[PDB]
Design a protein around this ligand. Structure first.
Ligand SMILES: *[C@@H]1O[C@H](CO)[C@@H](O[C@@H]2O[C@H](CO)[C@@H](O[C@H]3O[C@H](CO[C@H]4O[C@H](CO)[C@@H](O)[C@H](O)[C@@H]4O)[C@@H](O)[C@H](O[C@H]4O[C@H](CO)[C@@H](O)[C@H](O)[C@@H]4O)[C@@H]3O)[C@H](O)[C@H]2NC(C)=O)[C@H](O)[C@H]1NC(C)=O
Ligand code: N7F
Ligand code: N7F
Ligand code: NAG
Ligand code: NAG
Ligand code: NAG
Ligand code: NAG
Ligand code: NAG
Ligand code: NAG
Ligand code: NAG
Ligand code: NAG
Ligand code: NAG
Ligand code: NAG
Ligand code: NAG
Ligand code: NAG
Lengths: 727, 733
C-alpha cells in the first residue's frame, strides 16, 4: 500500500473533517454548509436556511469571517484581514441588516479596525480604532467615542499590548460587556517606558532599504506596561458631552509594586470580578465589585476580596483560574490546587474566605465547562488514571457524591480525549472526540445525557486511510522514583519489537506541557513513522502538567534543569528497548522545545546523534517578562540572576562538538527574537563547533507562510534522513 | 611528505616573511626588528637602534601602532584601537618626546580620535575628533579648532562618510597637508538627506536588547552626500580668533548636477590639483589652483582645467588617475586610456589641453611610482605580454624610446610580480617580488640600478616547505573570438594529466578584476589542492582589468552578463580537458564573486554541481551608489532600470533546483547588507528550492574575526568535500 508521505502532510491530502457549530439559543445552532448558513433544531436535527450562499455574491470584497448579532437582526462581515501578532489583526467591517436586506452605508465601522464585538444581548457594538474605544447603540447610528488617549505603541484602550496579548489574555481584546450589555468594561495599557525590540523586515525585493520594526516588549526584569481598569454605562451616553468612565483601582496589596490585571469576569448585571496578580506571580487577589446606583461608582468590598497564593510555585497553570458565578452572583466555582497539589473545583460564597473542594483525587480538573442551576459540567483526566485523556463529567451542586462521567463509556476504544460545546443554557451539548481514533462529533441532550445523533464521524477519511500504511500510537509510562512518567510513541506500520528502529524525540517539556496524550494527529511525525520508519517519541517529565504540583512545580525557579535531565533519561529508558537503534537517536523541538533540544544536545550525555532546534529560547533574559518571571523570578542578584546565568544554551557550546545540530529561526520573529539563535550560533562559532543553520527571511515564530512551512519541513526531513542514513 | 592542511591555513603554520620598511630620508629607513625600531643606512646596510622595544612597555597599555614625526623628534602612539569600516577606526593617542625622553601628558589628543596625521615635514599634527578638525603646532600645546560644524552621521570635516571611504578615497582621512606643511586642505561631506541602512547588532550575550546600527549609506539611485573643499593656512592661526578656511568650489560643469570630489594632489607649496567626477562617471575635470598672496585665496584658472571623458565606459580603472607633478608644478604625468583603449602615461603642460603619450603598446601601465628630473619610474605588465605579471621600468624624460626594465631579469623564474618603495628623492628603491616563487625583498641604488643586498629571501619558509607536498600553479590562456583570456590553476601535488580531478572555479569577475596572476599565495585553495586533490581554477573574462578597455568596458551598463557567461565558458573549456571530472565542477566566490557564483548557479547551464556564495550582491539597487552607478548608470526608466531589473539573482531562483548551493552572510555586514542574501533565500523558499545556509552573527563583510574565519572555512570545506565525494576524518573532540 502507499504510505503517508511528506507531500501528503504538506498538501493536506488526507483531511480531518470538523463540525463547527455556533449555538444561538438553548435549542438551535448555526452551521455553515456549502457557504450557506443553516439553522438546526438540536432535538430533531431538522434544518432551515438561515442565510443563503448567494446573499453576498455582489459584495465586492472577499469575506474572511462573519458575526451574527445575538438577536439575529444583523451580520458583521469582516474583510481586508491583516494579521498582527498571535491573536491581533486589523480588518474592515460592513454591517448588513438581515430584516431590511440592506448594507449600512453611513456611520460605518472604520477601516483598520483593531477589535469589534457585539454586546451579548441585542445589537450594540463596541470597537477599537487607532487605540481608542467607540460604541454604536444601533448599526445605522453615529458612534460615541469613549476614550481620547489612544496612541500607537504607547496607550492601548480596549486592546492589549504585545505582552498582555501573548501571555495574559491570549487575545487582542481588552473589552468586556456586562451580561445584558448595559456596561462596557475595559482595560487601558500604558507602554510609555517599556523598551522596544527592534528587528529588520526586508519585504518584497522592490524595497530598497529594509524597514526596522519596533515593538514595545518587556524582556525579563525590564520595565513592564502599567494597567488601569474602567467601566462605562452605555445606556447613559450623550452626543453633547464626553463619556464618563469609572475607574476601578487595583487593591493596595497590588498597588505597592508591579502587578498585572489577569482576569475579568462579569458575575451579574451589576457585579464584576477582577483578578490581579503581583509581578512576583505567587500572590493574586480577586476583587468583587458592585455598582452603586446612588453614586454611579463601583465599590469592591474587602468582605468579598479573595486571596490566592502559592508556596511551591506560581498561581494557576499559566495564570489564576477563571471563576464561574452562579446566576445570582453570590457564589462561584473555581479550579484551585488542593493541599496535595492537585487542581480541583472549589466552591466559594462571595463573602466567605475558605472554599469547599467539591472534587478530589490524584488527577486534575482541566476546565469548568458549564454551570447550570443543578449541575456543574467539567473536563478532567480522572478516567483510568490517564493524565493524557480528557472526559466530560457532571456534578450535582447539592451533593458532591452525585458525579456522572458523560463521555468515558460512549466509545472507549476510539474516544478518550473530549472537548465540549454547550447550548446557551446547556440543554444540549456537542461532544468533540479528538482521539485516539478518528475524531468524532456527536450531539447530546443534557436532560438525561442521551445521545441524539452523530454529526461527523470522519468516515470519508477512514475510507481514504484504509489504502495507506498508517502508523500507530502507543501511550504508556515508565516509573522513576516511584512516580509514573508518561510517554507516547508514534510507531511505524507493521511494527516489529525484535527489529531496531531510529528514534526521534519530539520535545516541548515547558512548564505545564503535555506531549503524551490520546489525541489523533496527522502531522510531520505521521510521515516520519509511516514513510521513513522512524519511531517518534515524546515524554512528559518533571515540570509537565495535569499531574499535580509535585511534578509541575519541580522546575520552579529552575528552568533548564529537571525537564532537560528527564528527556535524556527517557531516551536512555527507550534506547535500550530492543526496538530502538541506540546509534540513531535524535531530538527536536520548536520554541521551549527548541530550548530543551539545545540544552539536551549541549549536555554531554552521548545519547543523541543529532537534533533540530526551531526558534529556540537560548537565555531567559531574552524572553518576555510575564512568562519568564512566572517560573524564574527576576534576573537580579537578590532574586534569581545566578540561575538565569546558569541555564543558557550558550554556556554549553563546547559540548555541541559531540552532536550534529540544525538551528532554524525566522528573522521577523516578534516572540522569540532572532537574537536568541544569533547568540547560540555566535557561541558555537566561538568554540569552533560546526553546525547547520537556516534563517527564514521575514517569517515569524510560526514559520507558517505556505512556502516557508513547506521549505522548513523539507529541510528538516533531509537533515533527519541524513542523520539516520535513510535514502 | 605531509600536505598543506586546513589547520595549516587556519593557524598560519607556514608564514610568509615580509620586509616592511619606512623611508625617513633619501638614504635611511626605519625597520622593526624584535620589537625595536632600527634606523638603516641604505648605502652600507649598517643599523643603529632608533627606539628600544622596552620604551613600548612603559605605558600600561598595548600599543597598536606608532608614527614617528618626519623630523624624528616625536613618536605618536596609537592605542585603544576600535575598528569601524574597511579603513576607519577610532583610537587614543599619546605623543612621546624623543628629545626630552618623556611622555607628553598635557593638551592630549582626545580619546575616540577618528584620524591623526603629522605634517609631511616637522611635527605639526592635524586630527579629527567628533567630526571636527583640530591642528596642534607643537605636541604639548593647545589645539586650534578649525571646524565647528561636525555632527555625527551628518557633517564630516576631514574624514570621509561611508561611501567616500569605501568607494572614492579608500581611506577614512579627508585631510591633505601641503608638501611643507603650511596649508591643510580638507573635504567636508554632508549626509543630511542620505538614507540610513539599519541592521541589528547583538553584541555580547549580556546585552538584553539588540542594538540597531544606523549608517548613512546611499544605495543605487538614492540621495548622495554633497561635498565641499577647503584650505586653511596653519602658519596664521590665532588663539584669539577662529580660523579662516578658504573654500575651493567645483567647476560649474560639475555644479550642474550631482558630483564627487575624486582626487586631491598637491603640486607645489602653493598649487593644489583637484579632480571632480560627475555622478554619471564618464566625465571628470581636473582643476589646478594657486595660492594668491594678495587675497589669501585660491584661484583655479579656467585655462588650466583638464577634462577627461569616456565614450565606452567610465573614467579610470575605479576612478580618474592621480597626476604626478614635476618639481616646478608646471607639468604632470598621468595614466590615461589611449585611442586603442590601453592605459598609458600621458604628459601634460598645466596651460595646454592636449597631452602627449610617452608609452604605448598592447599592455598597460599599472602605476607611476617615482618622478625625478631625469627619469619617470613605473610598473607595467609589458614583460612577455603577461597581463598578470608586474615589473618596474624607467623612462628617460628627454627620450621616450630609452626604456629600461629594472626588475624583468633579476630572477625571471622566481620573480614576475613586483612592487617598489623609493626613498625620499628616489636615490634608493626596495623591490618586493611577490611571486611566482617565494617573496623576495631586495635593495637597489638608482644611480646605476646596482643591487645592494637581499633584505628578505624567505629561506626559513623555503626550508619548511621542502617537507610539504605543495601544489603548483599554472598560468596560461584560452582563445575566444581571437582574444586571449587568461586563467590560472592551482594543481594538486604529483599532478597526473591521465587522472580526472574535481575542479573548483574561484571567481571574482567584477569590473577590472584580475584572478589569473603570478602571485605566490598560501590560502584555502592551497589546502584544497594539497590535501584534497582539487584543482582550483580562476579565469579573467570580459570586464577583467589590465588588458585594455575593449575587455574591461565589455560589461558597461551590463553587469551580470558577459562576465557570468565567460565563467561558464571557461569551466566548459576546462571540463573538456581530460584531467577534469565533468561530474565534479563547483564554483565559489565572495562579494562580487558571490554575485557571479549565484548568477552562474541560476543560469541553468548544467556545468556546475554545486557552489558557495559568500556575502553576495543579489540585486544592484541594494548596493552603493558610487560603485554600482559607475558600471550600471541610474536605476531609472530613462536610464538603466530595465537592466537593473534583469540582472538579479532572485529572478533565477527556479534554476537552483538543479544545483547544491551554500549561501553565507555576516549579519552586521555594513557593505553588502545581509538584506542581499535575505532576498536570495526568500526567493529560493518561494519557488520550493532546497539549499544550505549559514549566517555569522555580528560579522561584517570580511567574516574576519579569528573564530568566524576558522568556522567559515571549516564549514565550506565540509560542503565542497561532500559535493566532490571526498572522505571525512574523525578527530578526538
Ligand atoms: C424543525 O421542525 C419542527 C417541527 O415541525 C419545527 O417546529 C414547528 O415550527 C412552526 C413554526 O414556528 C410551528 O408552527 C405553528 O404552530 C402552531 C400550531 O402548532 C400545532 O400544530 C403544529 C403542526 O402544524 C404542531 O407541530 C404543534 O405541536 C401544535 O400541535 C400555530 O398556531 C402557529 O401559528 C402562528 O404562527 C404562524 C407563523 O409561524 C402564523 O402564520 C400564524 O398565523 C400564527 O400566528 C405556527 O404555524 C410549529 O408549532 C412547530 N412545531 C413544533 C415545535 O413541534 C421547527 O421550526 C423546525 N426547525 C427548523 C430550524 O427547521
Ligand atoms: N500554547 C502554547 C505554547 C507555549 N506558550 C503558551 C503560553 C504563552 C507562551 N508565550 C507560549 N509554548 C511555550 C513557549 C515558551 C517560550 C517561548 C515560546 C513558547 C509552547 C511550546 O514551546 N510548544 C512547543 C512546540 C511549539 C510548536 N511546535 C512544536 C513542534 C515540536 C515540538 C514542540 C513544539 C508548544 N506549545 C507552546
Ligand atoms: N579590493 C577590492 C574588491 C572590491 N572592491 C573594490 C572597490 C570598492 C568596492 N566596494 C569593493 N570588490 C568588489 C565588490 C563589489 C560589490 C560588493 C563588494 C565587493 C572585490 C571582490 O568582489 N573580490 C572578490 C573576493 C573578495 C574576497 N574573497 C574572495 C574569495 C574568493 C573569491 C572572490 C573573493 C575581491 N576583491 C574586491
Ligand atoms: C475603507 O477604504 C475604502 C477603500 O479606500 C473606502 O472606499 C471606504 O470608504 C473606507 N471605509 C470607511 C468606513 O472609511
Ligand atoms: C503613561 O505613563 C507615563 C509614565 O510611564 C505617564 O507619564 C503618562 O501620563 C501615562 N499616560 C496615561 C494616558 O496614563
Ligand atoms: C471630548 O474630549 C476631547 C479630548 O479631550 C476634546 O477634544 C473634546 O472637546 C471633548 N468634547 C466635549 C463635548 O467636551
Ligand atoms: C440590564 O441591567 C441593568 C443593570 O441592572 C438594568 O438597569 C437594565 O434594566 C437591564 N436591561 C434589561 C433589558 O433587563
Ligand atoms: C513568592 O516568591 C518569592 C520569591 O521566590 C518568595 O520570597 C515569597 O516567599 C513567595 N511567597 C510564598 C507565599 O511562597
Ligand atoms: C530521583 O531521585 C533522585 C534522588 O533524589 C534524584 O537525583 C533524581 O533527579 C530523581 N529523578 C526523577 C524524579 O526523575
Ligand atoms: C653607518 O655607518 C656610517 C659610517 O660608515 C655612519 O656614518 C652612519 O651613521 C651609520 N648608520 C647607522 C644607521 O648606523
Ligand atoms: C581617555 O580615557 C581614560 C579612561 O576613561 C581617561 O583616564 C583619560 O583621561 C582620557 N584621555 C583624554 C585625553 O581625555
Ligand atoms: C547640509 O545639507 C543640508 C541640505 O541637505 C543643509 O540644510 C545644511 O545646512 C547643510 N549643512 C552644512 C553644514 O553645510
Ligand atoms: C568660534 O566659533 C564658534 C562656533 O561658531 C563660536 O561659538 C565661538 O564663539 C567663536 N570664537 C570666536 C573667538 O569668535
Ligand atoms: C613653506 O611653503 C610656504 C608657501 O610657499 C612658505 O611661505 C614657507 O616659507 C615654506 N617653508 C620653508 C621652510 O621654506
Ligand atoms: C556618459 O554616459 C551616458 C549614459 O551611457 C551617455 O548618455 C553619455 O553620452 C556619456 N557621455 C560620454 C562623454 O560619452
Amino acid at each position: 500500500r502507499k504510505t503517508y508521505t511528506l507531500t501528503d502532510y504538506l498538501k493536506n491530502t488526507y483531511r480531518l473533517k470538523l463540525y463547527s457549530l455556533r449555538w444561538i439559543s438553548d435549542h438551535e445552532y448555526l452551521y455553515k454548509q456549502e457557504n450557506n448558513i443553516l439553522v438546526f433544531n438540536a432535538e430533531y436535527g431538522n434544518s432551515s436556511v438561515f442565510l443563503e450562499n448567494s446573499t453576498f455574491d455582489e459584495f465586492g470584497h472577499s469575506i474572511n469571517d462573519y458575526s451574527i448579532s445575538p438577536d439575529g437582526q444583523f451580520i458583521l462581515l469582516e474583510y481586508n484581514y491583516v494579521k498582527q501578532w498571535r491573536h491581533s489583526y486589523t480588518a474592515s467591517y460592513d454591517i448588513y441588516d438581515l430584516n431590511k436586506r440592506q448594507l449600512i452605508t453611513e456611520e460605518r465601522i472604520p477601516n483598520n479596525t483593531q477589535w469589534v464585538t457585539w454586546s451579548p444581548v441585542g445589537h450594540k457594538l463596541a470597537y477599537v480604532w487607532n487605540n481608542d474605544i467607540y460604541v454604536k447603540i444601533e448599526p445605522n447610528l453615529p458612534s460615541y467615542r469613549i476614550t481620547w488617549t489612544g496612541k500607537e505603541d504607547i496607550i492601548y484602550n480596549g486592546i492589549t499590548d504585545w505582552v498582555y496579548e501573548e501571555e495574559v489574555f491570549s487575545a487582542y481584546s481588552a473589552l468586556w460587556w456586562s451580561p445584558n450589555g448595559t456596561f462596557l468594561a475595559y482595560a487601558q495599557f500604558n507602554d510609555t517606558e517599556v523598551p522596544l525590540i527592534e528587528y529588520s523586515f526586508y519585504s518584497d525585493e522592490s524595497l530598497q532599504y529594509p524597514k526596522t520594526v519596533r515593538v514595545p516588549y518587556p524582556k525579563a526584569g525590564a520595565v513592564n506596561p502599567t494597567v488601569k481598569f474602567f467601566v462605562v454605562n452605555t445606556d447613559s451616553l450623550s452626543s453633547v458631552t464626553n463619556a464618563t468612565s469609572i475607574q476601578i483601582t487595583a487593591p493596595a496589596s497590588m498597588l505597592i509594586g508591579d502587578h498585572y490585571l489577569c482576569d475579568v469576569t462579569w458575575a451579574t448585571q451589576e457585579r464584576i470580578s477582577l483578578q490581579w496578580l503581583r509581578r512576583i506571580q505567587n500572590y493574586s487577589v480577586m476583587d468583587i465589585c458592585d455598582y452603586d446606583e446612588s453614586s454611579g461608582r463601583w465599590n469592591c468590598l474587602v468582605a468579598r476580596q479573595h486571596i490566592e497564593m502559592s508556596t511551591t510555585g506560581w498561581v494557576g497553570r499559566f495564570r489564576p483560574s477563571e471563576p464561574h458565578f452562579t446566576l445570582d452572583g453570590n457564589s462561584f466555582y473555581k479550579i484551585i490546587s488542593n493541599e496535595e497539589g492537585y487542581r480541583h473545583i472549589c466552591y466559594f460564597q462571595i463573602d466567605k474566605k475558605d472554599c469547599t473542594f467539591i472534587t478530589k483525587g490524584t488527577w486534575e480538573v482541566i476546565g469548568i465547562e458549564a454551570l447550570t442551576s443543578d449541575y456543574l459540567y467539567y473536563i478532567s483526566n480522572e478516567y483510568k488514571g490517564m493524565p493524557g485523556g480528557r472526559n466530560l463529567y457532571k456534578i450535582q451542586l447539592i451533593d458532591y457524591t452525585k458525579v456522572t462521567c458523560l463521555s468515558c463509556e460512549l466509545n472507549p476504544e476510539r474516544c478518550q480525549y473530549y472537548s465540549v460545546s454547550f447550548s446557551k443554557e446547556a440543554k444540549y451539548y456537542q461532544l468533540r472526540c479528538s482521539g485516539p481514533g478518528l475524531p468524532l462529533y456527536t450531539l447530546h441532550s443534557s436532560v438525561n445525557d442521551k445521545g441524539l445523533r452523530v454529526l461527523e464521524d470522519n468516515s470519508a477519511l477512514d475510507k481514504m486511510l484504509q489504502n495507506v500504511q498508517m502508523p500507530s500510537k502507543k501511550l504508556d509510562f515508565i516509573i522513576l522514583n516511584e512516580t509514573k512518567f508518561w510517554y507516547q510513541m508514534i510507531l511505524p506500520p507493521h511494527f516489529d519489537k525484535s527489529k531496531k528502529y531510529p528514534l526521534l524525540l519530539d520535545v516541548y517539556a515547558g512548564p505545564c506541557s503535555q506531549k503524551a496524550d490520546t489525541v489523533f494527529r496527522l502531522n510531520w511525525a505521521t510521515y516520519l513513522a509511516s514513510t521513513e520508519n522512524i519511531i517518534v517519541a515524546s515524554f512528559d517529565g518533571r515540570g509537565s502538567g495535569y499531574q499535580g504540583d509535585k511534578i509541575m512545580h519541580a522546575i520552579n525557579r529552575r528552568l533548564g534543569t529537571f525537564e532537560v535531565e528527564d528527556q535524556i533519561e527517557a531516551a536512555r529508558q527507550f534506547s535500550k528497548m530492543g526496538f530502538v537503534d541506540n546509534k540513531r537517536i535524535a531530538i527536536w523541538g520548536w520554541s521551549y522545545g527548541g530550548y530543551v533540544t539545545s540544552m539536551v544536545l549541549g549536555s554531554g550525555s552521548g545519547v543523541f546523534k543529532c537534533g533540530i532546534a526551531v526558534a529556540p529560547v537560548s537565555r531567559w533574559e531574552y524572553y518576555d517578562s510575564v512568562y519568564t518571571e512566572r517560573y524564574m523570578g527576576l534576573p537580579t542578584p537578590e532574586d534569581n540572576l545566578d540561575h538565569y546565568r546558569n541555564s543558557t544554551v550558550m554556556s554549553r557550546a563546547e559540548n555541541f562538538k559531540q552532536v550534529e545540530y540544525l538551528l532554524i529561526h525566522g528573522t521577523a520573529d516578534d516572540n522569540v527574537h532572532f537574537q536568541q539563535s544569533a547568540q547560540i550560533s555566535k557561541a558555537l562559532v566561538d568554540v569552533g563547533v560546526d553546525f547547520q543553520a537556516m534563517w527564514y527571511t521575514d517569517e515569524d515564530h510560526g514559520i507558517a507562510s505556505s512556502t516557508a512551512h513547506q521549505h522548513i519541513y523539507t529541510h528538516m526531513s533531509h537533515f533527519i534522513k541524513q542523520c539516520f542514513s535513510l535514502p
